[PDB]
Amino acid sequence: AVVKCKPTSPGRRHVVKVVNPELHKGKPFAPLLEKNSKSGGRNNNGRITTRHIGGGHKQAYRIVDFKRNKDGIPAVVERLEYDPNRSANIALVLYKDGERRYILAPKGLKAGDQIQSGVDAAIKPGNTLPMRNIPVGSTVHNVEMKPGKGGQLARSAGTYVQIVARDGAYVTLRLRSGEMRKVEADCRATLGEVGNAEHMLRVLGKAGAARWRGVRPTVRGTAMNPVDHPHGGGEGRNFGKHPVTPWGVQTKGKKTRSNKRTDKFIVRRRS
Amino acid sequence: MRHYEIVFMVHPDQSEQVPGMIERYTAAITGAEGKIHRLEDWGRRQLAYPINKLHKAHYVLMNVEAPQEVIDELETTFRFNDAVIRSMVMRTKHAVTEASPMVK
Amino acid sequence: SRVCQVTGKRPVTGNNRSHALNATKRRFLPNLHSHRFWVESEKRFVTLRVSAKGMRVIDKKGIDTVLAELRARGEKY
Amino acid sequence: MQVILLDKVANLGSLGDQVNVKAGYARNFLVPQGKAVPATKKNIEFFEARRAELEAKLAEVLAAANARAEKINALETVTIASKAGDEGKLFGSIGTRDIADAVTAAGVEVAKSEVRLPNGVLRTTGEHEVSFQVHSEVFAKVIVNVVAE
RNA sequence: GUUUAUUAAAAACACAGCACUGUGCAAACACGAAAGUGGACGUAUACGGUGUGACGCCUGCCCGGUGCCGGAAGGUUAAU
């Protein structure tokens, strides 16, 4: 439920919260946590590789089952939890033999439902089965690219991938970007759209709310000196040049994909 | 309960598996304490027009007096099975028992 | 290190000469490839980071002759 | 790449032939599979005086080791009681090694590289046929019935 | 809120928002002769770049030039 905030102060004027009352109001499950130390966008050389990353609230990492290998054993869903590590909410599930794991929460999943992986699983939102067992034309998420590698496609808060075709060893997918990609028919996928679909309806409202998420401010390139950026300089506002990166690569329109290994897997590009 | 008339259309190469499907469906209905009034295999039959790039199909008529909850379970069985091509469920005012004009 | 294990080839340094004969220092890297060679006597594969010249040497001398030299040189393989 | 052969290869020569090949064909396939020796003049006098008929003796005892094993594989039934769904629609597929696991249990102790399959999956629950490559030339067939568990 | 430590605190920068564009994951990109690492233990409701700068009403015409994208019949054209 989106909640428009009342304008008691500027900085609360434009805030829309996304309030989900079903999330667990307690501590997360302690065995599945581990330390997630921040980086600041800096590699092992100490240099800033990717800009604008730094600060933000401390975040513990939640070990999430993407591989989803407990086949045959049914699992009931204990509660839904908030995950700071990702945009989608996660679900704490309890198998029959007593193991607890975290999965990505699908759209219609709530506390108390039963999920089950494996080939003999039913087709309800939550089950995970190889895509030679999933009917053509259904919406799945948490899709593997390689069998047993773990789900890599359609993991962000409201995404999903449709299965449009199958020719023997491959299935053809309609990715969320609109790209048509071939994936082997033995890769696991999880039924239904992924949960937190109204995540994109939030508006942060103030500058500090982006600093809470560890997003340092972005200085636009024309506000610099020519030693700093190709856009920099000028006596006033001058931009008489084609828009490039800080490293002189065209940005408005120039393609950058240079992977000739995976070109056989791409049916059509995005539009 | 609610008298339904169910007719489904089987892929003709799966014509051998048809009495195995009918006995499960009757056990779905009678297991849910529903009645089955007539049950008329029509065999292979030439289609009026080729559905799904093929020219023949195997027809089964089935009249059922079941509660509406298990028929909705039964419809999903027709949806995900690839042996059945088309399925049509039609609500009927009463229980019909007389033979079909093409069973004749 | 870009060193062929068989022939001992090594990146040498030279010049890029332009049309106006402007000399900038460059390197000549050897055409190294990691290749599994079947040793028939020891009945196993041995990976050697070897140049394509060295693969011509192994095709001429034989892998048993070359691995004798690598032990006589004192080089792991 | 002048090379002497240790076995007949289907497109260039029989045993005892000195035929030009490409370098990548001898170095990657023929020599590492024991099918050819590079034509060194030390190896020719090693081969041509003695092994031109000694290996011909060893080639016959290999085809005779097949023709004893391949002949008794006419029992022509392999019951693999795998889990399946209803009305066909097999639960879990059967690959080459699972076929090789069960013909091991009835007949020749066979390997996973011997099984030849047009589909490989055998998704259809029921009976099927499986061709073999027990020799490079001499082939066998066994009807295999995939049975629901 | 930020800024010229030590003559300039501002209308400059940033900003939430908006849009364009790149990017299917061994992602683009960045630091690195390389191995690797960051992006990210993230997966297009994600990430990078660029411009604009809450909000309200809006954002018209021009593709000739310069870029970028798509095209592959012809002309031209390197080592070989």
Ligand SMILES: [Mg+2]
């Ligand atoms: Mg940025």
Ligand SMILES: [Mg+2]
């Ligand atoms: Mg911005």
Ligand SMILES: [Mg+2]
């Ligand atoms: Mg800015």
Ligand SMILES: [Mg+2]
């Ligand atoms: Mg300035």
Ligand SMILES: [Mg+2]
């Ligand atoms: Mg410059």
Ligand SMILES: [Mg+2]
């Ligand atoms: Mg001016």
Ligand SMILES: [Mg+2]
């Ligand atoms: Mg001007």
Ligand SMILES: [Mg+2]
């Ligand atoms: Mg000089």
Ligand SMILES: [Mg+2]
């Ligand atoms: Mg102020």
Ligand SMILES: [Mg+2]
């Ligand atoms: Mg000052």
Ligand SMILES: [Mg+2]
């Ligand atoms: Mg001052």
Ligand SMILES: [Mg+2]
């Ligand atoms: Mg990496």
Ligand SMILES: [Mg+2]
């Ligand atoms: Mg401005």
Ligand SMILES: [Mg+2]
């Ligand atoms: Mg305009």
Ligand SMILES: [Mg+2]
């Ligand atoms: Mg133009």
Ligand SMILES: [Mg+2]
């Ligand atoms: Mg034009």
